[PDB]
Amino acid sequence: MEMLPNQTIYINNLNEKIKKEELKKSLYAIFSQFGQILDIVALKTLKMRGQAFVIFKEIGSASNALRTMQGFPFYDKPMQIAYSKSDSDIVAKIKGTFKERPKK
């Protein structure tokens, strides 16, 4: 398994205690050392406490950050990361579950 370049990466095993602000600072503190971030998206709601997205300078820099930080103990949990546009948001869009009701 090897990732493919995309300007955005998706993170899905953050320690859920981490606030949006703490995620933002920790990404700026460490993940920018591995490619320079351009933008960050997480939320204080539980649905984005273990999960985040982050947009990088260039697709190669995004790839470098992703692969280097994959499995890294960024907190008391090893990170799990993928490149965007091959991640749960697009999977939910093609399933419809992004916006469809579970039943009518």
From Swiss-Prot:
GO terms for cellular component: catalytic step 2 spliceosome; nucleus; precatalytic spliceosome; protein-containing complex; ribonucleoprotein complex; small nuclear ribonucleoprotein complex; spliceosomal complex; U1 snRNP. Changing R49H: In allele SNF1621; sterile. GO terms for molecular function: identical protein binding; mRNA binding; poly(U) RNA binding; pre-mRNA intronic pyrimidine-rich binding; snRNA stem-loop binding; U1 snRNA binding; U2 snRNA binding. Its main location: nucleus. Keywords: mRNA processing, mRNA splicing, Nucleus, Repeat, Ribonucleoprotein, RNA-binding, Spliceosome. Residues 7-86 form the RRM domain. One of its GO terms (biological process) is female germ-line sex determination. Signal peptide: none annotated. It is found in: Nucleus. The keyword Nucleotide-binding does not apply. The keyword Membrane does not apply. Binds stem loop II of U1 snRNA. It is the first snRNP to interact with pre-mRNA. This interaction is required for the subsequent binding of U2 snRNP and the U4/U6/U5 tri-snRNP. Plays a role in regulating sex-lethal splicing. Belongs to the RRM U1 A/B'' family. Belongs to the spliceosome where it is associated with snRNP U1. Interacts with the SMN complex. This is U1 small nuclear ribonucleoprotein A. The chain holds residues 1 to 98 of 216 of the full protein.
